[PDB]
Design a binder for this molecule. Structure first.
Ligand SMILES: [Cl-]
Ligand SMILES: [Mg+2]
Lengths: 250, 241, 228, 111, 240, 235, 231, 243, 244
């Protein structure tokens, strides 16, 4: 045995292309549409819960994941690749930051750590790149609210609003017309739901849509009282009912 | 065309070795079914002993992973036992480290992560098996979580696996469309097993003797498999109404 | 020369949960380093941890396990259990053969119910309805053995716990100052009651020691550059 | 505390003549004030016309002789059955002994 | 670890990776070495395809390995740095243990040994570098000039050139260098070195570097103007 | 591609067979064993007249009683020589004696097949190992990259080897003197060399019991070349 | 064809070509004969020279006082395998004060050769071995193939033209097995056996190599004028 | 194509062709069988006499693991020896930790997981043997057969090698004609017959019969070779049936 | 076994070229142009972001210009993710040096270190090289203001003015035409922006498509200041130099 693939599986072609990264992006293109919109007092990330079977309980499959109390993530592409990246992202937030500084990492630096992991799968021996693009939304004290995209290459970019996957080209055009620097969080959620409807074929409701926000601190979700400085997580996943309420004002 | 030999992306963004591992899954020509009751989770699987020289008691694709968790496998037996041994080791380790029994969904996720690794690392091949984990979880209640060679997993109200999964799946879909509930509204596991066998008969259009089936049952604090005589008692009750 | 503080720490089980309490003195030898430290720590939202012995080891071990508990909670999509913290703590401590001088009372609630354990530096654990640790454990246990009963209410358990801490405060030289309390009830958020009692307030000084300005002789003044 | 060494007594004597050599030793083996054996051979024919004795701690003595005899065997294998000369044997035994410089064979060797 | 045998024999008994490393040397800028009676001169070509270059800070082609030995090269620039670093470490190691600086032959033998090692070790390619190593042995006044190549063979030379168009300048040196009477002074040696490069270089401007090494750790690099005076005098004698 | 340790359909190791082709391209080296000593001679083959030929070292001392000549990719021989020297010195340290020539040769040949995917390829050089010990007297061995070594009364390796070996076949007899061997090496080297043989493009050496291994001065060899020319003109 | 690039690849008919090519190296090797009675076991080997100036390559290697072998194929591989046997014989004596049984020696050689046929990077051994010995169950003769197959025999031959000697031994089986307490006659039978494999060349004094081991006979090799008696 | 050039590669069918090629090596080997009797198991194997020079009864093929398990295999003999060596290590470590000798089903999985592991990577070759093995433990007699893929099941009777079809047909008759069971001494006789009958696929050369058995009453649950009079009795019974 | 799938990233071609290095350089030739210009009183770094969007958050975005320490900055051309791996290693080397000697790392020593890391990937390990070319702008008290470039081969050279990325041939000709030795930072700022304006593949050069930085001794007295230009500051300098 032993891993005898100690050589790179991603290499430069004569034209300068890194084939495996391009193909990973093609897998992302086939993926279900997900989007992110940044408001003045929050960020929203959303996607479609494309249920593989009606017998499957799609609530048990989380496409939108909490990384830290103030950071959340969504993806387009290969689900299993996303799931393991979320596990690594959660751990690296502790091992390379919280266990050192006693606080959670700022959005940009966690994004940087996730990006590094994805970059290494592009160069290290005997592995393929991750077949996902990530959208990471978050808040921290000194940078405020932010939204980042991370690609299979390990490249990341900050966005005011964007979309990835299936209908991203049409969705990004839709977002360009609607976005301004004066949006409140509820306005961004409204625009998110409008944008997402265009790329969804079948049912469009709180059970088929996954949506989370980075907004105000939620002391009700903290689990304890007594420490004034601890005010609770800013990441909150919207319920099926909360989504449907906003679909009537749509 | 070495992108078809190892787990790297094709130009279409596909992993052919994963797709071919899904095809190996049906090599045994066996169909399995899982459903949930009020207090139990039942899994049934076809049993085929084509050789008379075989000891039929040793021919099985249902595994007792832990006291609480059971696992049925769709695929070749060598890969099935590979997955079974690992799942048992993982469940035992979990209990030692964290002081409580490994949940069914957590074990499924763990095995799904291990599968995901085989789809990304070139030196390891995927296992040509689909794993259906069942239990009565102390927090979530009756649970069905299924894993495949892609590293995908999800919870199910009910599920089916094998060459004729579609026929069974649609049959199950139609029943739950009528009842409008996420489980079989029945008190005893015996009747949930009877439901499972009845709907497999309807879907496949074949009759079963006691040696044509294999049954696993999960209750609170234990998973167990039924003997041929236990199954016979089930088959008699089905025929008598 | 590491900190090993004197303390009185207790844990008391009641009707619908568990309560833990502690004093607020940190010692350096015979010297009182901190007159109002916080000995009640968090492991998870509803699991809390009182610590005694080598101060650095108690804090470090509670934070490490708390970190791994959070990752475990996220991985399993489940609220963390007290027995998980207990098992992770004791296996860590046992591996180091007592060289990590952490002595803990662990207490909390989870889906399984309410729990109360103690952990010793060498890696042994105990179960109980009432427990005490620290240099004032004997003073506190004397009170617990005198007044504890079965089926305590929330308000009774807080009273018993704080009375046990007070016994340590007055009679043990290692313990003093204030009484912290944390209540963990089933179905409710855990309420941390920082400085629940403050019976040792410093009396007004007889004289102000504010010096006339210019009293201290100075050789050199210079503006320091903190900016870039 | 465990003492890895012991003293098995014994006395050996080597004398070189003009065209001969003798290596003699008593056959008594002891610990403290007890006799283990009245006849336990201590001087050994190691082949190639070489005789050897490693007196002191008998376990180390037996180990050394055994390893030297083995060295004679492998000298024949590696060097076309060449006879191991007494000077070459002596230098070889130095290396066997010094190999355990920091956990010595507790013996006084004579060949 | 990566263990793949990159340097292997072909049916005709050739090791192509070593031979292709020589082709990288053929592409490199021309380097030349000429030893006089009491000096050695190293000349190097600078391709004028790169102007806007900062010549103060740009890596110079001749490198001091110790105070008494120098190394120039033709081929891959990045590869050469690894050999230069190793040589410099070994030079100090030799001083530390032997209490004497390296001989020029010893230093050459070491560098040549490193190059050879990279031709039969797994997971590595050969150096795309040939070197000219020149200097004087400690307390010795006899000039030394050696050459190494990717295969790891090395030898002593009265005069030698490596790199692109080295065939042409070797042609020049073979008819212009007399062994019975080598360039008796620094001037004569530098002149013959500049002349040899002028067969190949193009403009005698910033395209020629010259470094003179004399006994007892006396090493100096000539400036643009000093070299320009040699370039001027050579062509004025040629107009005849 | 294909394994470095692969067998051909004929039952030969590809890489070993290919390294033998590299040795055929090497400069000629000749050895002749006599009862008065063993002579080793080599063609230097300088690529240019500016190359100082006395820096070409194709004959090398392993110990006082053992010498060695090489042919092929001569850079590969350096680690082989290093090993040989270490083995010779180490045996003396362990046994207070000289090592047998055969034992030394066997130790060198043990390196040969230590290649795979250890070194990445076989050595591309053949060695003529000559020496003296008390047990077997004057000896000459031919060490190949296959790990095989043959003892020879006389042997030629390199580009002119088959022509030289045919010549050695006719000339060698068991009563040759050291002087007769010296001239014989010079005669056969001169026959197979491209350039005209002199003291600067050829080198002689010998191993005797009394004086040990000695590389001949260019002045000493020049006299033997002149002695050769006259005796060939003598008939 | 497409399946002979390495030892880790079966062919569509279930063959291992690298092992078969290693077997081919033995067939190119010089002939060597093994045979035994109930008291003695004998090796006879035709040594091969490079040319008339060269020595004749040694074929027989001693492994212990009671055991040794002869080789045909790659000689360095025989040195590796015989060294391993020496160590195993030696381990048995040092640790257990016990002479290694010839049959157990065969099992050890089989297993060592097998590991080189199932793993990537390695190669099979390219040599055949004939092991003779005298242990607690009498005289023994083994034939080793680098496929891993080891076989206990009364007599055999390996190398080029070995079929002639093997047929002779198959005829003479009932005669030579009965040659007890007569070393010279058993060797004669072996020399006559190996003669059935000669063409153009005949057995000379530096050509022939003989080894013998028996009841009161340590493993000893005869070369040079010591075998002139049998020519 | 090219899917069959490397182990652990799934073909578009979902097949591992390298494992299927290993089966061809098994099918090329001599016939070996196993018979499960009332209180034990009987193993038998065909040993082809390639030449008169082979010493009779010396080249023993059947192997013991621990003291209660017997193993026989067809195909590449060295591969089988390698598998038994592993099995012996597995059995030793099991007994070391758990005291009790390894149960036969437990032992079966140890071999099974090991063989299966050699179908997971391209850096190893699958085993070129099918192994019939078994013995007696605390729950009684067990007979198993294990393929190159790692696949194994429990058997009433088992056969592999060149004459497996002939043997299987004979085994199937015994199962049908003896639902109550077969005695250990009967099984030895029947094993001799089946090998003699299966030798028709290898009729060119003559052969040597080798038999072993583990039986609770006949061998005290220990693996033993059938020797001398009992072996000759089985040979006579076999020779009588073919004529 | 595994050998079958090995691309062999560290081999010479028959012409004596490193395949992967050459192909990595081909990749870099499609990256946004980065320009460095060294003046007597400072250094200018100018770089073009690749075809951007109106929704890209520019003020928090960084793809071209990175700070290695207070004295040294880099402009990137190629794979941004590859560049960040090397940048972090360089930042650590600078700090290691500062801890060891209690002095800021000289520019060339840092450049040589990073270039040696790149070299290693071309000679051993069997991994693909980093698809990155750097322009190093820095200051130390030995050589003063310095410009360097390194590429995937690990080769580095010093420059007065240099470009990397797309259209380097056109850019280098334009720089060679208008550069003079006695030039000042404000003049160099103009040259850099004019060169990008002409070589760009975009229709027009605007603030949102640029990253800009200066290293000046325009820091109050005997010290050096790095200035990573803000989006509004890039917009102002574009108007000042008369490009928009
Ligand atoms: Cl996991
Ligand atoms: Mg894979």
């Amino acid at each position: 045995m032993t891993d005898r693939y100690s050589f790179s599986l991603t290499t430069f072609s004569p034209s300068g292309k890194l084939g495996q990264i391009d193909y990973a992006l093609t897998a992302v293109k086939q993926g279900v549409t997900s989007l992110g919109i940044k408001a003045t007092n929050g960020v929203v990330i959303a996607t479609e819960k494309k249920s593989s079977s009606p017998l499957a309980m799609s609530e048990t499959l989380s496409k939108v994941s909490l990384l830290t109390p103030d950071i959340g993530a969504v993806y387009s592409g290969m689900g299993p690749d996303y799931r393991v990246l979320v596990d690594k992202s959660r751990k690296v937030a502790h091992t390379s930051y919280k266990r050192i500084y006693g606080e959670y990492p700022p959005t940009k630096l966690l994004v940087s750590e996730v990006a590094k992991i994805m970059q290494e799968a592009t160069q290290s021996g005997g592995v393929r790149p991750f077949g996902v693009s990530l959208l990471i939304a978050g808040h921290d004290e000194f940078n405020g609210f932010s939204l980042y995209q991370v690609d299979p290459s390990g490249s990341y970019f900050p966005w005011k609003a964007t979309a990835i996957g299936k209908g991203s080209v049409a969705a990004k055009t839709f977002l360009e017309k609607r976005w301004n620097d004066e949006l409140e969080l509820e306005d961004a959620i409204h625009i998110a739901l409008l944008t997402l409807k265009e790329s969804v074929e079948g049912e469009f409701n709180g059970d088929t849509i996954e949506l989370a926000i980075i907004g105000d601190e939620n002391p009700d979700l903290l689990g304890y009282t007594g420490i004034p400085t601890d005010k609770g997580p800013r990441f909150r996943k919207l319920t099926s009912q909360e989504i449907n309420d906003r679909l009537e004002a749509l | 065309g070495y992108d078809r030999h190892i787990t790297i992306f094709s130009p279409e963004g596909r992993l052919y070795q994963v797709e071919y591992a899904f095809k190996a899954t049906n090599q045994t020509n066996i169909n399995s079914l899982a459903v949930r009751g009020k207090d139990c989770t039942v899994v049934i699987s076809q049993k085929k002993v084509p050789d008379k020289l075989l000891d039929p008691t040793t021919v099985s694709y249902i595994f007792c992973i832990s006291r609480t968790i059971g696992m049925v496998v769709n695929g070749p037996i060598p890969d099935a036992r590979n997955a079974a041994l690992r799942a048992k080791a993982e469940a035992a380790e979990f209990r030692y480290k964290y002081g409580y029994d490994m949940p069914c969904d957590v074990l499924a996720k763990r095995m799904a992560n291990l599968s995901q690794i085989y789809t990304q690392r070139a030196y390891m091949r995927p296992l040509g098996v689909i794993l259906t984990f069942v239990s009565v979880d102390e927090e979530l209640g009756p649970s069905i979580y299924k894993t495949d060679p892609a590293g995908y997993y999800v919870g199910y109200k009910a599920t089916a696996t094998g060459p004729k999964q579609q026929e069974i799946t649609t049959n199950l879909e139609n029943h739950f469309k009528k009842s409008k509930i996420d489980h079989i509204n029945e008190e005893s596991w015996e009747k949930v097993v009877e439901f499972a066998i009845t709907h497999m008969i309807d879907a496949l259009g074949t009759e079963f003797s006691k040696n044509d089936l294999e049954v696993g049952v999960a209750t609170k604090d234990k998973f167990f498999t039924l003997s041929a005589e236990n199954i016979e008692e089930r088959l008699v009750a089905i025929a008598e109404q | 020369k590491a900190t090993s503080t004197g303390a009185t720490i207790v844990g008391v089980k009641f009707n619908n949960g568990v309560v833990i309490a502690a004093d607020t003195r940190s010692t350096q030898g015979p010297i009182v380093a901190d007159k109002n430290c916080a000995k009640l720590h968090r492991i998870s939202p509803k699991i809390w941890c009182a610590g005694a012995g080598t101060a650095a080891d108690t804090e470090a071990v509670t934070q490490l396990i708390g970190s791994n508990i959070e990752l475990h909670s996220l991985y399993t999509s489940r609220e963390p259990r007290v027995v998980s913290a207990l098992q992770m703590l004791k296996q860590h401590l046992f591996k180091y053969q007592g060289h990590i001088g952490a002595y803990l009372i662990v207490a909390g609630v989870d889906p399984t119910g309410s729990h109360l354990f103690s952990i010793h530096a060498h890696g042994s654990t105990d179960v109980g309805y009432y427990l005490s640790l620290g240099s004032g454990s004997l003073a506190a246990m004397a009170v617990l053995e005198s007044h504890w009963k079965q089926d305590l209410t929330k308000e009774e358990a807080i009273k018993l716990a704080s009375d046990a801490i007070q016994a340590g405060i007055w009679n043990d030289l290692g313990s003093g100052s204030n009484v912290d309390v944390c209540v963990m009830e089933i179905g409710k958020d855990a309420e941390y009651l920082r400085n629940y009692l403050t019976p040792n307030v410093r009396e007004e000084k007889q004289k102000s020691y504010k010096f006339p300005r210019g009293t201290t002789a100075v050789l050199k003044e210079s503006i320091v550059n903190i900016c870039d | 505390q465990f003492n890895p060494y012991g003293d098995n007594g014994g006395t050996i004597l080597g004398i070189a003549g003009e065209d001969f050599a003798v290596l003699a030793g008593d056959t008594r083996n002891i610990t403290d004030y007890s006799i283990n054996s009245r006849y336990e051979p201590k001087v050994f024919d190691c082949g190639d016309n070489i005789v050897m004795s490693a007196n002191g701690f008998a376990a180390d003595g037996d180990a050394l002789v055994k390893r030297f005899k083995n060295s004679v065997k492998w000298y024949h294998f590696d060097h076309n059955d060449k006879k191991l000369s007494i000077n070459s044997a002596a230098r070889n035994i130095q290396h066997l002994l010094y190999g355990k410089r920091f956990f010595p064979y507790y013996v006084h060797t004579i060949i | 670890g990566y263990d793949r045998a990159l340097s292997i024999f072909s049916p005709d008994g050739h090791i192509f990776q070593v031979e292709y490393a020589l082709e990288a040397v053929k592409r490199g800028t021309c380097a030349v070495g000429v030893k006089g009676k009491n000096c050695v001169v190293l000349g190097c070509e600078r391709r004028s395809t790169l102007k806007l270059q900062d010549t103060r800070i740009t890596p110079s082609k001749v490198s001091k390995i110790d105070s008494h030995v120098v190394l120039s090269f033709s081929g891959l620039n990045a590869d050469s740095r690894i050999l230069i670093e190793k040589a410099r470490v070994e030079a100090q190691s030799h001083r530390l243990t032997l209490e004497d600086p390296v001989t020029v032959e010893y230093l050459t033998r070491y560098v040549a040994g490193v190059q050879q090692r990279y031709t039969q070790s797994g997971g590595v390619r050969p150096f795309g570098v040939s070197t000219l190593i020149a200097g004087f042995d400690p307390r010795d006044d006899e000039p030394k000039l050696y050459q190494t190549e990717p295969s790891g063979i090395y030898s002593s030379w009265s005069a030698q050139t490596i790199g692109r168009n080295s065939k042409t300048v070797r042609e020049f040196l073979e008819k212009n260098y007399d062994r019975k009477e080598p360039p008796a002074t620094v001037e004569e040696c530098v002149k013959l070195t500049v002349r040899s490069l002028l067969e190949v270089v193009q403009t005698g401007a910033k395209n020629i570097e010259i470094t003179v090494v004399k006994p007892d750790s006396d090493i100096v690099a000539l400036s643009s103007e000093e070299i320009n005076q040699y370039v001027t005098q050579i062509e004025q004698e040629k107009q005849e | 591609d294909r394994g470095v340790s692969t067998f051909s359909p004929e039952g030969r190791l590809f890489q070993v067979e290919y390294s033998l082709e590299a040795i055929k391209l090497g400069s000629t080296a000749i050895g002749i064993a006599t009862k008065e000593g063993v002579v080793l001679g080599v063609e230097k083959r300088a690529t240019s007249p500016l190359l100082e030929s006395d820096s070409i070292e194709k004959i090398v001392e392993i110990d006082r009683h053992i010498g060695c000549a090489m042919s092929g990719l001569t850079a590969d021989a350096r680690s082989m020589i290093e090993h040989a020297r270490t083995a010779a010195v180490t045996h003396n340290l362990y046994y207070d004696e000289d090592i047998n020539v055969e034992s030394l040769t066997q130790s060198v040949c043990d390196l040969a097949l230590r290649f795979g995917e250890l070194m990445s390829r076989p050595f591309g050089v053949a060695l003529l190992i000559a020496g003296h010990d008390a047990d077997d007297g004057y000896q000459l061995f031919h060490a190949e990259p296959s790990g095989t070594f043959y003892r020879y009364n006389a042997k030629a390796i390199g580009s002119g080897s088959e022509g030289a070996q045919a010549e050695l076949l006719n000339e060698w007899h068991s009563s040759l003197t050291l002087k007769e061997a010296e001239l014989l090496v010079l005669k056969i080297l001169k026959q197979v060399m491209e350039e005209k043989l002199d003291e600067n493009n050829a080198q002689l050496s010998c191993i005797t019991k009394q004086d040990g291994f000695k590389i001949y001065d260019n002045e000493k060899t020049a006299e033997l070349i002149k002695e050769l020319k006259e005796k060939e003109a003598a008939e | 064809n497409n399946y002979d690039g390495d030892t880790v690849t079966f062919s569509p008919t279930g063959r291992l070509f690298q092992v078969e090519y290693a077997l081919e190296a033995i067939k190119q090797g010089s002939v060597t004969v093994g045979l035994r009675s109930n008291t003695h076991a004998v090796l006879v080997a035709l040594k091969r020279n490079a040319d008339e100036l060269s020595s004749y390559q040694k074929k027989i290697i001693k492994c212990d006082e009671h055991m040794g072998l002869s080789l045909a194929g790659l000689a360095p591989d025989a040195r590796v395998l015989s060294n391993y046997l020496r160590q195993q014989c030696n381990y048995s004596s040092l640790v257990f004060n016990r002479k290694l049984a010839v049959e157990r020696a065969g099992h050890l050689l089989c297993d060592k050769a097998q590991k080189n046929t199932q793993s990537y990077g390695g190669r099979p051994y390219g040599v055949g071995l004939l092991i003779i010995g005298y242990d607690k169950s009498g005289a023994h003769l083994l034939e080793f193939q680098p496929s891993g197959n080891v076989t206990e025999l009364y007599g055999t031959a390996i190398g080029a033209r070995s079929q002639g000697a093997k047929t002779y031994l198959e005829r003479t089986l009932d005669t030579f097995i009965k040659i007890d307490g007569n070393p010279d006659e058993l060797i004669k039978a072996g020399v006559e056996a190996i003669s059935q494999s000669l063409r153009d060349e005949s057995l000379t004094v530096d050509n022939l190599s003989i080894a013998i081991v028996g009841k009161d006979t340590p493993f000893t090799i005869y070369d040079g004028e010591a075998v002139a008696k049998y020519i | 194509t090219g899917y069959d050039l490397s182990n652990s590669v799934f073909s578009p069918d979902g097949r591992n062709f390298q494992v299927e090629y290993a089966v061809k090596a098994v099918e090329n080997g001599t016939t070996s069988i196993g018979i499960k009797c009332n209180d034990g198991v009987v193993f038998a194997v065909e040993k082809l006499i390639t030449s008169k020079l082979l010493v009779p009864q010396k080249n023993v093929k059947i192997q013991v693991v621990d003291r209660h398990i017997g193993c026989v295999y067809s195909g590449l003999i060295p591969d089988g020896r390698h598998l038994v060596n592993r099995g012996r290590e597995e059995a030793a470590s099991f007994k070391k930790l758990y005291k009790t000798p390894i149960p036969i089903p437990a032992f079966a999985d140890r071999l099974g997981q090991y063989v299966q592991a050699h179908t997971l990577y391209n850096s190893v070759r699958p085993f070129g043997v099918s192994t019939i093995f078994g013995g007696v433990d605390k729950n009684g007699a067990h007979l198993y057969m294990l393929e190159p893929s790692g696949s194994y099941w429990g058997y009433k009777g088992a056969a592999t090698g060149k004459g497996r079809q002939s043997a299987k047909a004979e085994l199937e008759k015994l199962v049908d004609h003896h639902p109550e069971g077969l005695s250990a001494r009967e099984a030895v006789k029947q094993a001799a017959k089946i090998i003699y009958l299966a030798h028709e696929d290898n009729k060119e050369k003559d052969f040597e019969l080798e038999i072993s058995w583990c039986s609770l009453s006949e061998t005290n649950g220990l693996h033993k070779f059938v020797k001398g009079d009992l072996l000759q009795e089985a040979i006579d019974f076999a020779q009588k049936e073919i004529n | 076994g595994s050998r079958r799938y090995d691309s062999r990233t560290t081999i010479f071609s028959p012409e004596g070229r490193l395949y992967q290095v050459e192909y990595a350089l081909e990749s870099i030739s499609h990256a946004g142009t980065a320009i460095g210009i060294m003046a007597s009183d400072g250094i200018v770094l100018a770089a073009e972001r690749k075809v951007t969007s109106t929704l890209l958050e520019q003020d928090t975005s960084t793809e071209k210009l990175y700070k290695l320490n207070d004295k040294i900055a880099v402009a990137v051309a190629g794979l941004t993710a590859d560049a960040e791996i090397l940048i972090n290693t360089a930042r650590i080397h600078a700090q290691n040096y500062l801890k060891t000697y209690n002095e800021d790392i000289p520019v060339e020593i840092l450049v040589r270190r990073l270039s040696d890391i790149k070299q290693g990937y071309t000679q051993h390990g069997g991994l693909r090289p980093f698809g990155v070319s750097f322009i190093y702008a820095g200051y130390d008290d030995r050589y003063g203001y310095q410009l360097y470039t390194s590429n995937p081969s690990g080769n580095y050279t010093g420059w007065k003015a240099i470009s990397v990325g797309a259209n380097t041939s056109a850019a280098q000709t334009l720089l060679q035409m208008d550069y003079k030795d006695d030039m000042k930072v404000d003049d160099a700022i103009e040259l850099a922006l004019k060169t990008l304006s002409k070589t760009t593949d975009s229709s027009a050069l605007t603030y949102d498509r640029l990253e800009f930085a200066t290293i000046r001794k325009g820091a109050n007295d005997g010290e050096v200041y790095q200035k990573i230009f803000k989006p509004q500051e890039i917009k102002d300098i574009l108007v000042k130099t008369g490009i928009t």
